[PDB]
Amino acid sequence: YRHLALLCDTMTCRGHLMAITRHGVNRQDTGPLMKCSFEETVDVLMEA
DNA sequence: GCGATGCGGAAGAGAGTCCCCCACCCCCTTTTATAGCCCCCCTTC
Numbered sequence: 462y463r464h465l466a467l468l469c470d471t472m473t474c475r476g477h478l479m480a481i482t483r484h485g486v487n488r489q490d491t492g493p494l495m496k497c498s499f500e501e502t503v504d505v506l507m508e509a
Numbered sequence: 510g511c512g513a514t515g516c517g518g519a520a521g522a523g524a525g526t527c528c529c530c531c532a533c534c535c536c537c538t539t540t541t542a543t544a545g546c547c548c549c550c551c552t553t554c
């Protein structure tokens with residue numbers, strides 16, 4: 462359960478349903494370098 | 510009467526898995542020697 466509970470917590474820790482796509486994982490306030498390694502490498506870095 | 514605006518729906522992006530003018534050079538022409546090559550007309554039968 463702890464593995465399942467951890468995934469659900471990360472998807473709801475910010476008070477809204479956060480998808481595990483780029484639209485939810487890159488929107489969270491992480492560093493641009495982490496975001497660029499996931500998806501949208503240049504668009505993420507251009508915005509930063 | 511006289512304007513002014515937010516939301517749903519549709520659309521659309523965006524990401525993942527040629528013709529002319531201006532130098533410069535060559536050939537036009539003439540002379541001559543050389544000789545193989547080849548076109549053209551003539552001649553043969």
